Amino acid sequence: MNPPPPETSNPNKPKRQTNQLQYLLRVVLKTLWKHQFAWPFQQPVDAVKLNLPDYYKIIKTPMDMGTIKKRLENNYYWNAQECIQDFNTMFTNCYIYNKPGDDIVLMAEALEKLFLQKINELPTE
Amino acid sequence: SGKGKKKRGY
């Protein structure tokens, strides 16, 4: 079976607005979300629907952009690095599960290049 | 063992 998706809201966590967090939602997430290669990354990988029975043998930290978007929207992240870590986990999950050169991998590589171009201009801490 | 070939979105 699939695991439950990652948590996206916790009312007991403290909340802050920061320029870094705003940029991560309004520039980084938004830019990747609208990209023509985004759709396979907009929700959790459904290993049941996609017939990937071994997916969770190696992917012990699932992540996707739908989860990241919701986390940003619900003030789940305190430090910008928490969000950056989640993007990076999404990419690196893809590269450990899927054969090099598979279409999903080439899509993730293009998205990661774009992510790094946007993260380059992240506001200071 | 993989997800197959992919189509792009709009």
Residue numbers in the entry:
A (entry chain A): 43 to 167
B (entry chain B): 310 to 319
Paper text:
Bromo and extra-terminal (BET) proteins provide a recruitment platform initiated by the recognition of acetylated lysines (Kac) by their tandem bromodomains (BRD, Dhalluin et al., 1999, Jacobson et al., 2000, Owen et al., 2000). Direct targeting of BET-BRDs by small-molecule inhibitors such as the high-affinity and pan-BET specificity thienodiazepine (+)-JQ1 (hereafter referred to as JQ1) enables their displacement from Kac. Multiple decreased interactors harbor sequences that can directly associate with BET-BRDs in canonical or new BRD-mediated structural binding modes, and we propose that the tandem BRDs present in each BET protein may be capable of simultaneously recruiting both a histone and a second interactor.
Based on our earlier work defining the flexible G at the X1 position as a binding preference for histone H4 (Filippakopoulos et al., 2012), we fixed this residue to screen a subset (91) of all 2521 unique K-GX-K motifs found in the human proteome, focusing on nuclear proteins with Kac sites annotated in the PhosphoSitePlus database. Our data therefore suggest that Kac-XX-Kac motifs beyond those found in histones can be recognized by BET BRDs.
